[PDB]
Each structure stands twice: as C-alpha cells, then as structure tokens.
Amino acid sequence: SPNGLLQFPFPRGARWHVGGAHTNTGSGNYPMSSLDMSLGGGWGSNQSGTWVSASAAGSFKRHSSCFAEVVHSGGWSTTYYHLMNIQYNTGANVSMNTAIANPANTQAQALCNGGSSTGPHEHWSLKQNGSFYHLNGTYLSGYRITATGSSYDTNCSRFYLTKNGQNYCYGYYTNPGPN
Ligand SMILES: [Cl-]
Ligand SMILES: [Zn+2]
C-alpha cells in the first residue's frame, strides 16, 4: 500500500498497541501480511468502546460474525479477524476511519473461523488482488513498514516503522490518519 493510502485500523487520534508483522497463520516468514493490534484488556473485558476502524474507504464484506474485509481501490483490500459486534453487512460503503467492529472479548467468538489467540485483539491483514501481501515496504499512516524477520519478530533491526527518517519499534502508536 503506497504512502497515504491506508491508516492504522483503529480510531484516528487513538493510541493502540501494534505487534510484529507475521503471516496470516502466524508461522513462517513469507508473506508477512498481518499485524495484531489492541487497546487493552483480557478475555471478559469490556471491548464495546474499542473500535476496530477501516484502514481506508471501500466496499464491506462480512465473511462471518468475527471476520470482515474492506475492498479498496487498486486491488488492495484489508481484512480484520477476531471481531465481534460488526457494524456493517456485505455491500456497505465504509469510509476511512469508519468504526466497523470491536475486538472479540471471548475466545470462542474470536476464533469463530479457527486460529489461536491469547487475548482480545484484531488480526489485521493487507491483501492485493485477493492474495496476502508482504508488508515490507508498504505504508500505514505514513509510516514505512520494514519486516525482514520471522513471524511476530519484534527485534527492532528487523521490524520497525519509519517516518520522516526516524525508526520506531513495535508498541503503542497514536493514529494520525493516513499521512
Ligand atoms: Cl450495512
Ligand atoms: Zn495476527
């Protein structure tokens, strides 16, 4: 995703935790399409005010009660997994920063289509032409992503976000919007 196309998939102005890039399944080192993002709280916590947000405007796909996709321009799409309280149905037009769901606050709901999770979060992925895309060299909220390690690697020489020449390791990020 080129610089300016996508914002972080959480509210503009909010400050959420961003983990290391990983493949969709969490094993291997390619394509590292995915990032886990959360605000806080474990299983059972109140996530009803924690709003997973559309990375860009596009067309909504509600795959299940825990899994959504937004189809953007240019063959790009973003996907959002481990959800509850999805706010749109398939075919809806959503905007950049539209609140689309909460992170599922129970494991059974978070894993409604399989997988594993240690706690409430969104598993966000970038796709191009319907295939998982490798995040190295892509942009998110104006940060250039470097991802050259294995899944979930947070070593700050192999996973970091770069903006205005400064590198930033994994951790909490305030969402400025797409730039
Ligand atoms: Cl709708
Ligand atoms: Zn994940």
Numbering used by the authors: 1 to 179
Give sentences from the paper.
The Blp structure was determined at a resolution of 1.57 Å by the molecular replacement technique. The analysis revealed that the Blp structure had a folding characteristic of the M23 family proteases, the LAS superfamily. Comparative structural analysis of LasA and Blp showed a high degree of structural homology (rmsd = 1.07 Å) despite the low (44%) amino acid sequence identity of the mature parts of these proteins. The active sites of LasA and Blp were almost the same and represented a groove, the walls of which were formed mainly by four loops (1–4) and the bottom by antiparallel β−sheets (β3–β4–β5–β7–β2). The active site of Blp contained a five−coordinate zinc ion by conserved His 22, His 123, Asp 36, and formic acid, which was replaced by Wat1 and Wat2 in the LasA structure. A comparative analysis of the structures shows that a ligand, formic acid, was located at the place of these water molecules in the Blp structure. Sodium acetate, which was used in the isolation and crystallization of the protein, contained a formate impurity. The C−terminal subdomain and disulphide bridge Cys156–Cys169 were preserved in the Blp structure. The conformational lability of the Cys112 side group in the Blp structure was implemented in two positions, one of which did not form the cysteine bridge in 41% of cases. Access to the LasA active site was more restricted than the Blp active site due to the bulky charged side groups Arg60, Arg68, Trp41, and Asn20.
